[PDB]
Scaffold this active site. Structure first.
Site, short mmCIF file in Angstrom:
data_model
loop_
_atom_site.label_atom_id
_atom_site.label_comp_id
_atom_site.label_asym_id
_atom_site.label_seq_id
_atom_site.Cartn_x
_atom_site.Cartn_y
_atom_site.Cartn_z
N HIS B 22 77.55 22.22 62.62
CA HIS B 22 78.20 23.03 63.63
C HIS B 22 76.79 23.63 63.76
O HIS B 22 75.88 24.31 63.02
CB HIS B 22 78.87 24.14 63.08
N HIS B 29 83.27 15.55 67.40
CA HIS B 29 83.56 15.20 66.28
C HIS B 29 85.25 15.89 66.24
O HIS B 29 85.74 15.91 67.06
CB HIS B 29 83.16 16.29 64.91
N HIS B 66 88.67 21.34 60.37
CA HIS B 66 88.18 19.76 60.06
C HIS B 66 88.14 18.99 59.29
O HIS B 66 88.90 19.05 57.72
CB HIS B 66 86.66 19.95 60.26
#
Ligand SMILES: CN(C)CCOP(=O)(O)OP(=O)(O)O
Ligand SMILES: CN(C)CCOP(=O)(O)OP(=O)(O)O
Ligand SMILES: [Mg+2]
Ligand SMILES: [Mg+2]
Ligand SMILES: [Mn+2]
Ligand SMILES: [Mn+2]
EC number: 5.3.3.2
Lengths: 176, 180
Positions: B22, B29, B66
């Site tokens: 990031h 992603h 994530h």
């Protein structure tokens, strides 16, 4: 810079360095709050910088500060408007002269203030001080009130308290 | 922690260390977003901690994250709920599986994600992780959606985009019913 400590009757009793003054046990001091509108009548809402000691990263009314000893409320507004937003304004007008509050921020930092509220119109473009302001929005007051009424927690506690004061809100509706 | 990288079609190609991934130059992603409700049907709104790399101090929906290599999106949702919020949940429901977005945050960090959105019910007390979350509110969805409509700039961009999606919104509305 300092804050001015106040007693029960609201008489100044002394001063504290401003940064030093805002703690988990913040004592009652003098402050102001200001709501800025442009010539078209939009409301300037600002987002306090992440480095602010109290309520960093929080959306709030245009400009707030701490009057210094011997300074009028109107001059404090003008000084902080220049300082935080590099903007010139019309003579600030009173919208909520007896506002006072105490609140705790998410990290435990307290504001405890006698905080008269003013309104003014900007007369020049903004020039942001990114030590104070990390973002801002020129908005219609009506939407900001709706946002305040619907999700008050998305805004600073004092902004919410000011905007929900019946009279203050009437007075704010005149800069539009 | 790492992110899973994707191409245009949304096909994994590999992984990247998360912090490292990031930046102002974020590649596509995989991610997830979840909207959490309590038994009463109130929506958990949270405020990202000041230490987050992206959108620190911003109000947003319950939990995002994530998925890791070897991890289902749903398992990732469960883990993050635990990690960020200390909270147990019902099996996450898919409410916007094809949400994808790119956004730049106030300091220039980019999110570029394929980000399926879920909803679930919490089944335990919260135990906020102050490393991740700095504040929270239990709210009525309607109030939240009204806030988002009035002052959308006061919330994370993805919260807003998800909340205005007709289908997602309908499904969030189903989680407002009281549920014993
Ligand atoms: C409404 N109260 C909190 C006044 C607070 O103003 P600030 O927090 O901006 O103080 P200062 O701007 O002087 O740093
Ligand atoms: C919806 N996107 C932002 C997913 C990423 O959200 P986070 O900021 O929580 O990422 P992470 O939780 O992994 O730190
Ligand atoms: Mg100020
Ligand atoms: Mg997260
Ligand atoms: Mn103060
Ligand atoms: Mn990401």
């Amino acid at each position: 810079e300092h804050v001015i400590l106040l007693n029960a009757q609201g008489v100044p009793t002394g001063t504290l360095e401003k940064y030093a003054a805002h703690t988990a046990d913040t004592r009652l001091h003098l402050a102001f709050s200001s709501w800025l509108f442009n010539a078209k009548g939009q409301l300037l809402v600002t987002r306090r910088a992440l480095s602010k000691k109290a309520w960093p990263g929080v959306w709030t009314n245009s400009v707030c500060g701490h009057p210094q000893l011997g300074e009028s409320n109107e001059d404090a507004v003008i000084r902080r408007c220049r300082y935080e937003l590099g903007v010139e304004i019309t003579p600030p007008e009173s919208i909520y002269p007896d506002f006072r509050y105490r609140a705790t921020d998410p990290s435990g930092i307290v504001e405890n203030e006698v905080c008269p509220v003013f309104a003014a119109r900007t007369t020049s473009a903004l020039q942001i001080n990114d030590d104070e302001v990390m973002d801002y929005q020129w908005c219609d007051l009506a939407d900001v009130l709706h946002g305040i009424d619907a999700t008050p927690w998305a805004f600073s506690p004092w902004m919410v308290m000011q905007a929900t004061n019946r009279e203050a809100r009437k007075r704010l509706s005149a800069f539009t």
